[PDB]
UniProtKB/Swiss-Prot annotation, chain D:
It comes from Trypanosoma brucei brucei. Disulfide bonds: none annotated. The chain holds residues 46 to 146 of 584 of the full protein. Coiled coil: none annotated. It is found in: Mitochondrion; Mitochondrion inner membrane. Belongs to the ATPase alpha/beta chains family. This is ATP synthase subunit alpha, mitochondrial.
Length: 102, 136, 46, 101
């Protein structure tokens, strides 16, 4: 009865709007082109998209929000799902981001 | 350097393709850990390597900044007390100039040992100085 | 004829330079992405 | 130029550029300084430091006696930037960028 996320590694390097992740030994691993959450704080996360899966195990991440909050050594959780956004007649007349945030 | 015969024989084998408790993706820091695990498995003792890493970590705290780039493990007295497998690996890293991976090869080796011994480690992340209470 | 010839001879020089630069950039990218592995030699035997 | 200590040995030579591998203990070289490559026991060629690599390798731009430079030769460090003679004692003379007449 816990909201258990799926930690897959740590943040190794940051170059502008993209990042690289190093997987912790013996972890489930992340899937290609999936969304991941970088724990910038115990309650705040930054969104990223998986772009590369290298032989070394390192993961290429495209950051989407809260980039300034991302630092090397932070934890990363894997949602394990592709990108889904709100859709419907309830969005008309509104300004939204690609992630669905109004 | 005069490595022992057992390590010499193992170093020339395709130990990288052998079976291990876990299937970790190949990496530079993983090759050394696999070599240590394979060497220790023959003797059956794994805690010796862990003690060697503890000594290395303690010794490194006193070494000068950026000691991994002018490093000579043979001349360093702190490493003279290490086991043959660990000492061979350190020389192996120094030859390739990868002594900066000491703190990561150890993590992999511990993971292999825990998997082999059937131990599950739970990391408890706590605030600095808040580790007093861990009952929950 | 003397003004369109210069722009034609200036264009061929720029075109050669850019195409070559592109190729070398790709060559350097594929070289950079490559990493040397652990050297499996008898280091002690020396 | 006044030399202070050896700071490594010449490793590679690609035309007018060169690389130096560190001496034992990695004494270190200040960036953008002038170094003296012992091409001969009494002859020292001039180089400019332009890169300090993480491994300890130094990037050098050779100035003179580039042909004389060979891999394995020692390198000494002046510890100072390039300084050249200046004043009324140089008027009417022909010099090179290093200040040599």
């Amino acid at each position: 009865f816990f909201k258990t996320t799926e930690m897959i590694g740590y943040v190794h390097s940051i170059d502008g709007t993209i990042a690289t992740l190093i997987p912790a030994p013996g972890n489930p691993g992340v899937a290609y082109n999936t969304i991941i959450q970088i724990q910038v704080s115990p309650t705040t996360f930054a969104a990223g998209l998986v772009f590369n899966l290298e032989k070394d195990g390192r993961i290429g991440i495209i950051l989407m929000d809260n980039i300034t909050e991302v630092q090397s050594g932070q934890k990363v959780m894997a949602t394990g799902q592709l990108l889904h956004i709100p859709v419907g007649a309830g969005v008309l007349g509104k300004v939204v981001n690609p992630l669905g945030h109004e | 350097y005069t490595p022992p015969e057992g390590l010499k024989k193992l170093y020339a084998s395709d130990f990288e393709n052998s079976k291990y408790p876990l299937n970790i993706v190949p990496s530079d820091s993983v090759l050394f850990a696999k070599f240590l695990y394979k060497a220790a498995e023959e003797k059956g003792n794994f805690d010796n390597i862990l003690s060697d890493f503890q000594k290395i970590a303690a010794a490194a705290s006193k070494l000068p900044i950026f000691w991994e780039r002018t490093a000579v493990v043979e001349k360093i007295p702190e490493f003279k007390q290490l086991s043959e497998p660990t000492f061979f690996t350190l020389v192996w890293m120094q030859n390739n100039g990868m002594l900066e991976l000491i703190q990561e090869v150890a993590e992999v080796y511990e993971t292999f040992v825990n998997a082999k011994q059937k131990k599950a480690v739970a990391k408890i992340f706590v605030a600095p100085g808040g580790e007093k209470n861990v009952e929950e | 004829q003397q003004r369109t010839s210069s722009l034609y001879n200036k264009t061929r020089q720029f075109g050669i330079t850019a195409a070559l630069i592109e190729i070398l950039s790709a060559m350097s990218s594929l070289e950079g992405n490559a990493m040397k592995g652990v050297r499996r030699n008898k280091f002690w035997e020396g």
